Amino acid sequence: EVVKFMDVYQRSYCHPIETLVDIFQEYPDEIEYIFKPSCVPLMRCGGCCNDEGLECVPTEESNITMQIMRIKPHQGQHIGEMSFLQHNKCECRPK
Amino acid sequence: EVVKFMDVYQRSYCHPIETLVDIFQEYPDEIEYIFKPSCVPLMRCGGCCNDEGLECVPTEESNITMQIMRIKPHQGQHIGEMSFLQHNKCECRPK
């Protein structure tokens, strides 16, 4: 049945939401390893703003540490800690 | 606390996840109008398959109806119903 307007509106407005993030996006300089899993669940800003000229962006952020399987193709693999940024608070700011 | 590898691995794996989707994306023929909210919360496949040849895609889908404010800028606006696609089940498939 039908999702009411104010429910849609409040649920979609700019806020941190669990987002599955590719590790290569987080570590864009990495060219030596591949990773399992290849993506991680992180809280990141998402959703929309009242004014279409605005973007939902973080105003507070902090790192979380996750164990990732770090693989060097044809050589080996190791469980290692890697840090990932999470968004704690978000606001609507100009595009 | 450090997130353990098997916890990261299981939570990142291909599954339906709440995703904030721009309405204009879903409906590029809706040129004439503005929408509030401009995006909606939808269950969509997300996450990783850990085989760069495989991607996470829907194998079961359904529709959901939501109340959305349709706006003709500086002219008028009306709360109407719009239907969106959701993903109920996902699997890892070749790209």
Q: Which of A8, A18, A20 sits opposite B37 (nearest CB)?
A: A8
Check CB contact under 8 Å for A8 and B41. yes
Q: How many CB atoms lie within 10 A of CB A30?
A: 12
CATH code assigned to B1-95: 2.10.90.10
Separation CA A92–CA B33 (nearest Å) = 22
* Contact list, A11 vs chain B (CB under 8 Å): 41
By what technique were these coordinates determined? X-ray
* Contact list, B11 vs chain A (CB under 8 Å): 41
Given resolution (angstroms): 1.6
A76-94 vs A54-72, strand pairing mode: antiparallel
Check CB contact under 8 Å for B66 and A40. no
Beta strand segments in chain A, E: 15-22, 34-36, 39-46, 54-72, 76-94
DSSP chain B: -PBPHHHHHHHHBSEEEEEEEEHHHH-TT-TT-EEESSEEEEEEEESB-SSTTEEEEEEEEEEEEEEEEEEETTTEEEEEEEEEEEEEEEEEEE-
Q: Are B34 and B76 in contact (CB under 8 A)?
A: no
Check CB contact under 8 Å for B39 and A50. no
Q: Which of B10, B83, B84, B88 is nearest to B45 (CA)?
A: B88
Check CB contact under 8 Å for A20 and B69. no
Q: Are B56 and B48 in contact (CB under 8 A)?
A: yes
Residue keyed to tokens 């993506």: A39
CB burial of B46-72 (b: ≥16 within 10 Å; e: otherwise) equals bbbbbeeeebbebeeeeebebbbbbee
**Domain segments of chain A as ranges:** 1-95
DSSP 8-state symbol, A95: -
Q: Which of A3, A36, A79 sits opposite B50 (nearest CB)?
A: A36
Q: What is the CA radius of gyration of chain A?
A: 17
Cβ neighbours for B38, distance < 8 A, ≥ 6 positions apart: A48, A49, A52, B22, B23, B24
DSSP 8-state symbol, A4: P
Q: Are A64 and A40 in contact (CB under 8 A)?
A: no
